[PDB]
Structure formats: C-alpha cells, structure tokens
Write a protein that binds this ligand. Structure first.
Ligand SMILES: C[C@]12CCC(=O)C=C1CC[C@@H]1[C@@H]2[C@@H](O)C[C@@]2(C)[C@H]1CC[C@]2(O)C(=O)CO
Ligand SMILES: NC[C@H]1O[C@H](O)[C@H](N)[C@@H](O)[C@@H]1O
Length: 373
C-alpha cells in the first residue's frame, strides 16, 4: 500500500509466514517468558547472508525464510529486501526504524570485495575484521559499536564470546513510536498487572478515551485493539482471555492477522495500556535450524561468495530488539458516544505486533507477560 514499495510488496506473504513460524517456535522453547524480536530484521540479516551463500546453504536460507524458489527469483528477494530496508530506514519516510545488520569475521579469513559491495549496496551491511582471540577487547569493541550505533539505546549485545568464533552475525533495532492519538500523561497511574497469578506487579498504566480500531474473535477469545503511530507504523494489541494464550500462540499466523484487520471497526472506549520498555536478546541458531536452516551453521556451509573459499560458517547470530512505549505524542468532528462506553484494560499478558502500513511488513512481535522485566 505505497507504490514506491513495489519490490518490497512482493515479499509480504513470505515475510509474514516466516515471522509467525519463528514466533510459534520460540514460544515452545520458552513458554512463560517475555518474547520480543524483529521479524523484518531477522529476515533481512539472513537474506543478506544468502548473497554470499551457494548451493544448498543458499537454498535452505531462502526457503527457511519462507520463499519458494520455483515461484520467485533470487533477484527479486534481494530487490525486495533492499526496497524494504530503504523504506524502513529512510529519514523522509514513515517509520525511521534504523534497523542494522553487522558481521564480525575472524581476522584469519579472507573477504571478497564483491560480497562487501553487494551487501553494502543491498543491505547496508557493515563488516568488521575481528580478533576473537582477544575476547575481552572483542566484546568491549562490539558492544561499544552497538551502543554508539543506537545512540545509547542498546548496549551489551554479546558477553563471553568463544575465542574460536569464525563469524558473528549481529542484527539489532531500537524503536519508539510516536502515537497518532496520544495518551494524556496527567492520567497515567500505577495499576496492577496480573502476570501468573502467583505473581502481580505494579506498572504505570496509561489511559485514553476515544475511538479505536477494535475487534473481538470468539474463536480465539481475544480482544484486538489497533493504534496507529504517526507515520505509517501501526500497533495491534492482542489481549487473550485468562487461559487462552497457549492457544493463541499455536494458531497465530498471517491469516489470523488478515481476519483481524478485515474486521476492525472504530469503537469509542476507555483504553488502559501500560507505559513500558522491552528487550529481547537471542542467539537464534537452534530456532533457525528447526526452521530448516542447517548447513550455514555447520562445516558443510558454502559461504564461498563471502571469503572466496569454502572455509566459513556462521558461528553465532545474535538478534536484539528494543522498544519503548509511553504516552507521547502529537478539531471539528466528534462522536456523541453511548452513556456507558466499554473499557479495555491490558492488565494481564498480551501480544504487541507492530507493522508498517506502507510495506505491509511485521516490524516487531512482542509477547508481554511482565512489563516490569
Ligand atoms: C496479514 C497481511 C495480509 C496477508 C499477508 O499475506 C501479509 C500480511 C502481513 C501484514 C498485514 C497484512 C494485512 O492484514 C494488512 C495489514 C494488517 C498488514 C500490516 C499493516 C496492515 O496493512 C494494516 O494494518 C492495514 O489495516
Ligand atoms: N541473482 C542476482 C542477485 O544475487 C547475486 O548473488 C548478486 N551478487 C546480486 O547483486 C544480485 O541482485
């Protein structure tokens, strides 16, 4: 839904499929914890490796990313992702996501100019020769890099790095949206959030009254509220009924998303939503292995497009996503609402799904069980 987004849009179902398989996988390996990551950022970091991959290494990357090579060209995927990053990262554009990919490669290996140029042009890759036999100084320099790159918002990407690391793939992304409809800060008050409930925490609960996109599904036992950001990003806030999270996790896919957005309608309501911040920080190898991306991690990797020899493999891929949510920030037609409008209060665990409306991509997937962690 942006026309400049032509190449990016060809990617829309494949990226959404990947986004939600990844989600299904990760909620299994960690069933009662905060989950927070950037699908678009993971998809983008891996497609970028595909630039340098050959044969079955390459085919597994692209397929595990949910592309079917018999129906889409490799040219189009890279064109797609270049168009996507360009739109998400562009200053004049609707998101300013500032999502970043970096590789840290052992000084003991060669790099091809062809890979460095292709990956810079397409994917804005920064690549660093790294002496992993100085773990202390490697760690400190990598974390300083993430810190400086994120204007302070993300620090401590890596800790205790194997001195035999061949290549670290880093993707990281910080976001704070500006709300199309701001919450009034005078009315934020600490209220109770029900984690367990053997557990209960106090959270600053924001408040706003007004017309918001809303939908209830009975099938899933979920209240859906959708809030726009200024620009083109939008947030779906999904409140499952007590006892219905496991079920929502196991079903959630892009068809569920399309159902929701097809059926949202503006409803006047009292909205209570926590002011909070969340990080997710993962080494994502297993998850991707389980999704069928195998050889890239093993000695059977063909990354010869990177080094010019079949000597490279991905030792470690760290993904860190970070988000702040608060009240901020910035007429002639106003509804005459019913006497006792509904109240929706996100005060028990919920999903937060952040998308771009210009490229129809999933920017963030959050499962918030405890907004004070
Ligand atoms: C699932 C969906 C439609 C089917 C598909 O294969 C890919 C997606 C993922 C992104 C979704 C999209 C549509 O639903 C419209 C959405 C929600 C979009 C993100 C932003 C969006 O354009 C809107 O929020 C407009 O309401
Ligand atoms: N198949 C074409 C596509 O993939 C290659 O690996 C090239 N290096 C890149 O520039 C191009 O867009």
């Amino acid at each position: 839904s942006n026309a400049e987004a032509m190449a990016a849009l060809k990617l829309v179902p494949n990226n959404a499929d990947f986004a939600f398989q990844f989600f299904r996988e990760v909620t299994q390996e960690a069933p009662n914890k905060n989950i927070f990551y950037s699908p678009v950022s993971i998809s983008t970091a891996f497609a970028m490796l595909a630039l340098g991959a050959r044969s079955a290494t390459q085919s597994q990357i692209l397929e595990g990313l949910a592309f079917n090579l018999t129906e889409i060209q490799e040219k189009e995927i890279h064109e797609g992702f270049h168009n996507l990053i360009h739109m998400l990262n562009h200053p004049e554009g609707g998101v300013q996501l500032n999502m970043m990919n970096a590789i840290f490669v052992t000084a003991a290996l060669a790099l091809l100019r062809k890979f460095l140029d292709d990956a810079k042009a397409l994917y804005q890759l920064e690549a660093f020769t790294t002496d992993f036999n100085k773990p202390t100084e490697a760690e400190k320099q990598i974390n300083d890099y993430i810190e400086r790159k994120t204007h302070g918002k993300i620090t401590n990407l890596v800790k205790d790095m194997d001195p035999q690391t061949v290549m670290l793939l880093a993707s990281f992304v910080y976001f704070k949206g500006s709300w199309e409809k701001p919450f009034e800060a005078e009315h934020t008050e600490e209220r109770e959030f029900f984690v367990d409930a053997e557990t209960t925490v106090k959270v600053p609960m924001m408040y706003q009254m007004g017309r918001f996109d809303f939908y209830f599904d009975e099938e899933l036992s979920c209240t859906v509220v959708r809030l726009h950001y200024n620009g083109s990003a939008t947030a779906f806030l999904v409140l499952p009924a007590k006892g219905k999270m496991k079920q929502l996790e196991q079903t959630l896919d892009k068809e569920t998303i399309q159902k929701w957005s097809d059926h949202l309608f503006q409803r006047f309501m009292n909205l209570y939503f926590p002011k909070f911040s969340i990080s997710g920080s993962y080494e994502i190898s297993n998850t991707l292995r389980k999704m069928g991306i195998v050889d890239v991690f093993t000695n059977q990797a063909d990354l010869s497009g990177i080094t010019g020899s079949p000597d490279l493999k991905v030792s470690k891929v760290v993904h860190k996503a970070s988000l702040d949510v608060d009240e901020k920030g910035t007429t002639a037609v106003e509804i005459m609402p019913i006497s006792f409008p509904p109240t929706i209060e996100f005060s028990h665990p919920f999903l937060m799904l952040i998308f771009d409306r210009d490229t129809n991509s999933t920017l963030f997937i959050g499962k918030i069980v405890n907004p004070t962690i």
